[PDB]
Amino acid sequence: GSMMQEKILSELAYLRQSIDNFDITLIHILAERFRCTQAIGRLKARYNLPAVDPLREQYQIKRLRKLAIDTHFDPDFAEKFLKFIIKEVVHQHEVIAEKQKIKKE
Amino acid sequence: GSMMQEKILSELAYLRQSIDNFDITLIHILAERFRCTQAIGRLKARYNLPAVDPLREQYQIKRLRKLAIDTHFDPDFAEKFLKFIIKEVVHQHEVIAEKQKIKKE
């Protein structure tokens, strides 16, 4: 139909409003997460702690996987997602350390 | 110090509580986002719409970049993050279409 075509484009539009809202929300939460991990980066750099903390990484992954299963959410994708975030964090930790070091030199 | 060592481990622990909370939150929001994009996948598959919708992708990226700058959040990372999500979504759209098609065959 044309009534049916519009019904379908209207549903699509409605679902995309929601997605678009989720994406803003996700960015605001990640903004705060990165405020925290940057406070960790400064602390690690001042006191010579390493960017990659394997016991920490391992815990975060097992925990998020368990919580993902409990939410009926794919645990492999939860892990892929967390690892994506952690790679940026590890980069940021290294950038803060190089910048604390260039002051010291 | 040992007082100073514990102060620092205590700060680190406190920041990690927050991170860990943000990560659960992020998973719950993504759970809902994927409920929506899966409803889009079914709709696209029933009515023969393609997985990759370039005009849609382009809008989502420009919009999230602008909103990221307005939140003092790195627009390149916002884009990297959205593209990471969209790659999963496009996969999921293709999986739904293959599964609607195998019923039809």
Query: Would you give the end-to-end CA distance of chain A in angstroms?
Result: 72
Q: What is the experimental method? A: X-ray
Task: List chain A residues with CB under 8 Å of B37.
Answer: 15, 19
The residue written with tokens 């390493």 in the block is: A50
Amino acid at site B99: K
Query: Would you give the end-to-end CA distance of chain B in angstroms?
Result: 72
Q: Is B7 left (phi over 0), alpha (psi -120 to 50) or beta?
A: alpha
Cβ-defined contact of B22 to A36 (cutoff 8 Å): yes
HEC-encoded secondary structure of A45-86: HHCCCCCCCHHHHHHHHHHHHHHHHHCCCCHHHHHHHHHHHH
| Domain residue spans of chain A | 1-105
CA distance to partner chain B, nearest, from residue A105 (Å): 25
Contact between A29 and B21 (Cβ < 8 Å): no
Contact between B37 and B31 (Cβ < 8 Å): no
Interface of chain A toward chain B, CB-CB under 8 angstroms: 8, 11-12, 15-16, 18-20, 22-34, 36-37, 39-40, 43, 47, 56, 60, 63-64, 67-68, 71-73, 77-78, 81-82, 84-85, 88
Query: CATH for B1-105?
Result: 1.20.59.10
Q: Nearest residue of B to residue A46 by CA position?
A: B8
Residues 6+ apart with CB under 8 A from A17: none
- Residue B16 dihedral angles phi and psi, to the nearest 5°: -70, -30
